[PDB]
Design a protein around this ligand. Sequence first.
Ligand code: CLA
Ligand code: CLA
Ligand code: CLA
Ligand code: CLA
Ligand code: CLA
Ligand SMILES: CC1=C(/C=C/C(C)=C/C=C/C(C)=C/C=C/C=C(C)/C=C/C=C(C)/C=C/C2=C(C)CCCC2(C)C)C(C)(C)CCC1
Ligand SMILES: CC1=C(/C=C/C(C)=C/C=C/C(C)=C/C=C/C=C(C)/C=C/C=C(C)/C=C/C2=C(C)CCCC2(C)C)C(C)(C)CCC1
Ligand SMILES: CC1=C(/C=C/C(C)=C/C=C/C(C)=C/C=C/C=C(C)/C=C/C=C(C)/C=C/C2=C(C)CCCC2(C)C)C(C)(C)CCC1
Ligand SMILES: CC1=C(/C=C/C(C)=C/C=C/C(C)=C/C=C/C=C(C)/C=C/C=C(C)/C=C/C2=C(C)CCCC2(C)C)C(C)(C)CCC1
Ligand code: OEX
Ligand SMILES: [Cl-]
Ligand SMILES: [Cl-]
Ligand SMILES: [Fe+2]
Lengths: 333, 35, 451, 341, 61, 37, 80, 31, 35
Amino acid sequence: NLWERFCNWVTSTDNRLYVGWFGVIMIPTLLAATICFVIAFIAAPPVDIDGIREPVSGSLLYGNNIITGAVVPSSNAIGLHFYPIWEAASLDEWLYNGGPYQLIIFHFLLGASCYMGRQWELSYRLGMRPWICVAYSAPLASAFAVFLIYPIGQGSFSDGMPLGISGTFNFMIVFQAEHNILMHPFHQLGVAGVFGGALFCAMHGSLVTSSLIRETTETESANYGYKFGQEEETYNIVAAHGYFGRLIFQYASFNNSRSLHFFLAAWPVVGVWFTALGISTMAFNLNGFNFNHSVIDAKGNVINTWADIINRANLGMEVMHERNAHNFPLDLA
Amino acid sequence: VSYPIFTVRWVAVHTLAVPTIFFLGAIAAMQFIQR
Amino acid sequence: ATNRDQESSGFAWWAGNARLINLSGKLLGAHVAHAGLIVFWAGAMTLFELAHFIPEKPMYEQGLILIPHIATLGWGVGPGGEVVDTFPFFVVGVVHLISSAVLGFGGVYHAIRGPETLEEYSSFFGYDWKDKNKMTTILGFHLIVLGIGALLLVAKAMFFGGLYDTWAPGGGDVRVITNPTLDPRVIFGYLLKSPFGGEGWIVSVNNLEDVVGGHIWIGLICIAGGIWHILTTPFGWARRAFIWSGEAYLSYSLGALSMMGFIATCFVWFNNTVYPSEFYGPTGPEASQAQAMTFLIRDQKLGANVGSAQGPTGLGKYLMRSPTGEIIFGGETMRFWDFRGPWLEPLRGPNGLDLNKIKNDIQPWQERRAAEYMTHAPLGSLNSVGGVATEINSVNFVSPRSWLATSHFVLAFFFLVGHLWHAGRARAAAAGFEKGIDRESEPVLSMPSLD
Amino acid sequence: RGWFDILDDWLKRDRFVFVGWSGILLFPCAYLALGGWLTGTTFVTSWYTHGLASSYLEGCNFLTVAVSTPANSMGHSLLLLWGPEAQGDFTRWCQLGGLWTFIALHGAFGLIGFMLRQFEIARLVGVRPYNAIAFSAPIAVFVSVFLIYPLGQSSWFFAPSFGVAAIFRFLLFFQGFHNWTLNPFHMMGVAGVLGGALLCAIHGATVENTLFQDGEGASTFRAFNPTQAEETYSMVTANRFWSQIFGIAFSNKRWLHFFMLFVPVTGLWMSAIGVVGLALNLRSYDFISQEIRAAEDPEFETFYTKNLLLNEGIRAWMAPQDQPHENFVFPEEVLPRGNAL
Amino acid sequence: MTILFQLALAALVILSFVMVIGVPVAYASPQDWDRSKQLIFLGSGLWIALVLVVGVLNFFV
Amino acid sequence: KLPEAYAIFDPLVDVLPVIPVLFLALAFVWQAAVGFR
Amino acid sequence: TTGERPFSDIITSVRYWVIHSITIPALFIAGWLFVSTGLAYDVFGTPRPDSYYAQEQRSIPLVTDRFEAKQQVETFLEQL
Amino acid sequence: FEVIAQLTMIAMIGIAGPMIIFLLAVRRGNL
Amino acid sequence: GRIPLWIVATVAGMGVIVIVGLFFYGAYAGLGSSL
Ligand code: CLA
Ligand code: CLA
Ligand code: CLA
Ligand code: CLA
Ligand code: CLA
Ligand SMILES: CC1=C(/C=C/C(C)=C/C=C/C(C)=C/C=C/C=C(C)/C=C/C=C(C)/C=C/C2=C(C)CCCC2(C)C)C(C)(C)CCC1
Ligand SMILES: CC1=C(/C=C/C(C)=C/C=C/C(C)=C/C=C/C=C(C)/C=C/C=C(C)/C=C/C2=C(C)CCCC2(C)C)C(C)(C)CCC1
Ligand SMILES: CC1=C(/C=C/C(C)=C/C=C/C(C)=C/C=C/C=C(C)/C=C/C=C(C)/C=C/C2=C(C)CCCC2(C)C)C(C)(C)CCC1
Ligand SMILES: CC1=C(/C=C/C(C)=C/C=C/C(C)=C/C=C/C=C(C)/C=C/C=C(C)/C=C/C2=C(C)CCCC2(C)C)C(C)(C)CCC1
Ligand code: OEX
Ligand SMILES: [Cl-]
Ligand SMILES: [Cl-]
Ligand SMILES: [Fe+2]
């Protein structure tokens, strides 16, 4: 049976890269998104992102470098309308209105969801515990928040994050202008997540490296003291625990390697979950804390705080962003 | 048994805890200040 | 203490509810007590909202998420969403509170006093997760109950007073639905619509006839499926496709609930039919369109020609064309040209917005509605300061659409995470490696090298 | 045996809190830095240095309290309590921003004391001192941001104030005036921090999901004993999983954990170098080719030019209140604005 | 009879508090389960009767 | 507002919604009473 | 395991609470009275809500000189 | 006066929970 | 003479909850309330 042989090949763990059924979806979508991204980043013509006939050039051939180049989001006139190639009268019209962005982000989001499913699938085929995909759900939720959920809440894929470095910075600055994300607790939890993730990464790495058991001489690298597949632990967990328990106090230190590695998984994953949820909840315009004119003296004069200085910076960004796109006093979306 | 009382741990605990409770009382009083 | 520690159960305290997996009586107690919690929140929150309710002020200015649900059903409201009697709100709240006392009594009784396992007490109420017939029978009972609930919504719409209709002629009013759409073409064409802009899938249902007909179909389909699962055993393909265990069934429900939470978020954000703007406030698209309408009216009263006015970029300042040719509002609200609202449709002709009806047929109630919806846009801070993030502290407003959409996106995402967690764990536990790799029989050691 | 040796024995005694020789530097300085911050954010205003309320006593919350930097007219004065500005008066010292320099200097010497504590405990316990070497990167960040950056600028005023919203102001200032996102050293810092968070999450999840079954409990944390000799998880299974999912995988545990050390430390050091450059206003503000093209061609727009317009808005709208010593009076007509809004 | 209705509702609140504390205590203390069974049965009956009385008196006040 | 005959019970209504949150907290109290076994 | 009495042994004892039911409320009341008697304003120089501005001024009192800053703040306070 | 009634109501509810736990602990109940 | 540790933990957590709720109450009242 050809179908049985195909099923055996798809689910085979002997392939150099595992495919699986999630990979059967993942490989074509990510290949399409990757090829279209490379082509658009090099050679796409300028895109009228704001829908006001003001095309923004994001490709290398139209005057960009690596830093300033981007795949520009689709037109504000399109909004949330589905804009495939066959909906356009020609490829010139599709390129003018930012169709490549919609193609890339839709294929990428599908392929990355199937990447998460593929991680589960391979863990199941290898007899592993299944929750690496749960850890990967945090950056995937972040990608969904900036590419899909924020355009949905704001009503246009033009407000999605551009596929570029300076476009990303533009997204960040305009987002702070419109939503005050720095004062949002979910973004603060995300900063705690990534700062703590970097801290605990450096901490765990330095504590394991500090307690490596002497297996080599002074000339060779210490990494040759570990052999792949060896049964014994390559470092002294008790010595690292003794060091770190004397560094703070005994009960702030993990003596359990499993609890420590669960904490290493859990802290940045939960923090990034919260910051992705912050982006989505601000997509429905539930913004960060507003303390403008909160402190008032006895007469009634406004006493400024640091929040008022942040408000001045946000006002500068707000009045300069998309400088020709607004006709009315309130930036309602 | 025969544990001591005034150790280094006692000093560290109280140098953190005594001003903490004092400051908490101060801020709790601040909550009832009008313009 | 039966199964109430880690040594006997294998689960720590932080996974202590997993000790209830094979204890049907205590698990039933946990479920009934939790249902009592849900009903308690419904009743207590309704009474809390009613105690601070100012009936002349709009509902969406008062932080209400439950009174708008009762008002949409037609209880306590008149024309234009005006509250005429707060007593149905009180009745709903107190009946939920008392029923929650009853459910809490039952949950506590089955949790700590009743038999730990129901199998010895009753073959009917006892169950085993591996018995697929019993699982389908319980699913069939619950499907019949859900179908009866959908028919109860239909009965409210058709016989017991009707529903609030924001599209009723002459402003929104409570209307009895006498001709529900029973045509399967319309109902399942809603089911087959695109989810993208201008189509909106099932979120785009814009009349109560379609809502009531869809609930007639949903109730009949749920009752038929309930009878089907009571009378039939799962087939061979279903038996080979699923994991048959309690955690597996939980993970399936978690995925379903995550999808429903995402759909409810989109429903409350975009739909102004089953979430009337009289109660929930304007949608985001509605408020942007309202701002464009407001300044078109103001400048037309000053003598401007709104059809020939040219914005900074050369597009029309007030009126432009959608990519398919429709005459739409200009500015950034060009993204929201698929918005339909009862205050805007009188100005729409076959080719979109009509210049003559704009010039001559804009009523004062439409100008009032546009100004009100422009100044109550669903934008605000976490500490409930109305407006954009750069606004000062004077307006205490966050739209209930914002609260509902944000809260249910958070819940839907976390339930997707829970679905992934429990689906992976159910698969690993069915295959037998959820506790880790066997040292003696590690599978990768029996596999050839990749290179 | 000698008073030095007896004092050494007492300092290195096993305790709940280790003291050591480094404790003499660490505990007073760290305690005074933390106490100065709590005291300043609870009781001390910024009304005479910035024109701001910054304490709980004035009505600020946890996000908006700060110990603010001294006034720009202080220059880089150490602002000692007995110095020529305060002249021994504690109240005037608090009103002039002396708590900021108090916290900054005591925090710097406390960070020195903590790294010396890391060295001393590593020497006593008998381990390699890689934790102190890793802690060199937070020290580099603190020295570059809180000391070197204001020293390169006109005064302590442009250093970060010790507060949440004040740090947010510092971020937005660096965007508006320095275009700090465009700086490649900050980009390397971001790569290091996000890669460290990624490595932390991925290594924790990989270890937790390649565990060996060493007990019958469905919660696996009890299946580890600290004195055990065998590895608690399967490195071979983890390697095969990541080789087939991602293409590459670690095969050396020691190299993996050194890499976990290496990524965020290197990122923080690169960002500190960029902050030194910004101390001298040596910014990566602009690309000259793009600006020549945009000056000669009014149809050429990129995301970088839009970011430059946003920076102009930040500077013009922020400067009169963020820099009150300059006495900026920007009339309404000179403020750069887009249409409407 | 606003005073009578308020007395009935206050009694319902007091009895609800008493039942909220006593029902788990009686259910979880197995060495009192003769008297506490009848106390719970009487309290449940009285609570239901008070709920019905409060509803009727609401319609009369 | 509530119906007038219930106005004397208005403070109690004001604290009714937070009761489910306490239930979650109650679980931890109960676990602490049994030593988190 | 360091020769000190365990924290759980200490905080569950009655002598601890005999001492600390006195000391903890005394410190809390001391902080409360430190604020409510207005002493914190005197100690730290923090303005009261009626002490930010004079009655008809809107200019913020900002320190503009280094070695006369103490006198400038004193002059600000003399202007109420 | 209204907030005093609110605080005493929430105090009695939030003590009623731990009161149940305390009564079951002192009576050696099945807690 | 042993107060149970769960009682101490419950009372301390209730005190923390009361202090935090007081701080949020003061966020809506008096200084810093924008009123
Ligand atoms: C919706 C929340 C919810 C519900 C319904 C349950 C329900 C249950 N859990 Mg549980 N649990 C929860 C949350 C919840 N849990 C959380 C958040 C945690 C983490 C801390 C745990 C941790 C946990 C562990 C570790 C264990 C359970 C166990 C149990 C079961 C037996 C409990 C028992 O023996 O009581 C004993 C407790 C008491 C007798 C104290 C009194 C409790 C009563 C019910 C208080 C009622 C208060 C209320 C106001 C009364 C109203 C009455 C009125 C209507 C008349 C029970 C079905 C156990 C189990 O599986 O048993 C096999 C078990 O070992 N749970
Ligand atoms: C209908 C939904 C549902 C149901 C029935 C279950 C049922 C179960 N889950 Mg599960 N879960 C769900 C949704 C659900 N889950 C979701 C949505 C997620 C994603 C976050 C998870 C993630 C999850 C994990 C990671 C694990 C479980 C586990 C379990 C088992 C034991 C749970 C336990 O004792 O918790 C005890 C309860 C607690 C310890 C309390 C947790 C406190 C939460 C996280 C904070 C809540 C904050 C609150 C909402 C807001 C603030 C309140 C304020 C007072 C501070 C049990 C079978 C465990 C398992 O696999 O066992 C086999 C396990 O390890 N669940
Ligand atoms: C999910 C709900 C549910 C389920 C499946 C059960 C199941 C069971 N209960 Mg239980 N119970 C519940 C809720 C539930 N209970 C509640 C809420 C209470 C509080 C009132 C009780 C109080 C209770 C007691 C005191 C006892 C049981 C007993 C039993 C067992 C035998 C009952 C029997 O023979 O049928 C009897 C069937 C009936 C009396 C028919 C009732 C039909 C009702 C009134 C119609 C209601 C309409 C609709 C279905 C519900 C509307 C509410 C809805 C909107 C939520 C069985 C395991 C007994 C037991 O375990 O013995 C050892 C026992 O002594 N239960
Ligand atoms: C809560 C609702 C519920 C649940 C959990 C189940 C559960 C089950 N049903 Mg079932 N059923 C229900 C309601 C429900 N039923 C109702 C209301 C009816 C009446 C119409 C039926 C009629 C019914 C029949 C006739 C059969 C089942 C069967 C089954 C079993 C296999 C399910 C399966 O593999 O389908 C999973 C779904 C698929 C395999 C479909 C393919 C997946 C497509 C591609 C998904 C596309 C949808 C996508 C998400 C987009 C959504 C929008 C879309 C509508 C455009 C399972 C026990 C089977 C069985 O064994 O019964 C004995 C069977 O033959 N059901
Ligand atoms: C060991 C811990 C330690 C360290 C390293 C520091 C370090 C510092 N403190 Mg500090 N401090 C400490 C503990 C510490 N403190 C404690 C415990 C308190 C509470 C009492 C304070 C209270 C405090 C205040 C209130 C202030 C400082 C300040 C300072 C800074 C400037 C100090 C200065 O210029 O004098 C340097 C002095 C010496 C190095 C002493 C030299 C001694 C050697 C042995 C020479 C011998 C002298 C000789 C015997 C006497 C000569 C007699 C005659 C000829 C004069 C500096 C960073 C100031 C500050 O932060 O400014 C913003 C400030 O205002 N400190
Ligand atoms: C098992 C368990 C659990 C749980 C439990 C639960 C969850 C329960 C529930 C419960 C419930 C769920 C309950 C309820 C109750 C209720 C009540 C008791 C009520 C009553 C009512 C009333 C009394 C009313 C009144 C009134 C009216 C009439 C009107 C006006 C107003 C007022 C309010 C006055 C836990 C977690 C702890 C853990 C352990 C075990
Ligand atoms: C009420 C209403 C309505 C109606 C509605 C309806 C009529 C509905 C229906 C609906 C439906 C009718 C739905 C369905 C769904 C389905 C689903 C959701 C599915 C799922 C699936 C799954 C999950 C699968 C899975 C799988 C695969 C993938 C393969 C193999 C394996 C397994 C089996 C696992 C309307 C809108 C008109 C209006 C409004 C109101
Ligand atoms: C500067 C100065 C000084 C010093 C002083 C001091 C050293 C002080 C201290 C102070 C202190 C030492 C204070 C403390 C404070 C504390 C507080 C105020 C606390 C708070 C807390 C809280 C509020 C909590 C929270 C939390 C978290 C964090 C998370 C979870 C949840 C909870 C809620 C638990 C002297 C005279 C020497 C010299 C001159 C200058
Ligand atoms: C409707 C109503 C009612 C009802 C009520 C109820 C149903 C209640 C319940 C209640 C409850 C149910 C309560 C509870 C509470 C609780 C609490 C208040 C707790 C807290 C907690 C804490 C504080 C914790 C702590 C801890 C532990 C112990 C361990 C770990 C650590 C920590 C520290 C976290 C009555 C009858 C009045 C009448 C009228 C109306
Ligand atoms: O597109 Mn992108 O950013 Ca959201 O706000 Mn409206 O639209 Mn436009 O302005 Mn602002
Ligand atoms: Cl922009
Ligand atoms: Cl506009
Ligand atoms: Fe590790």
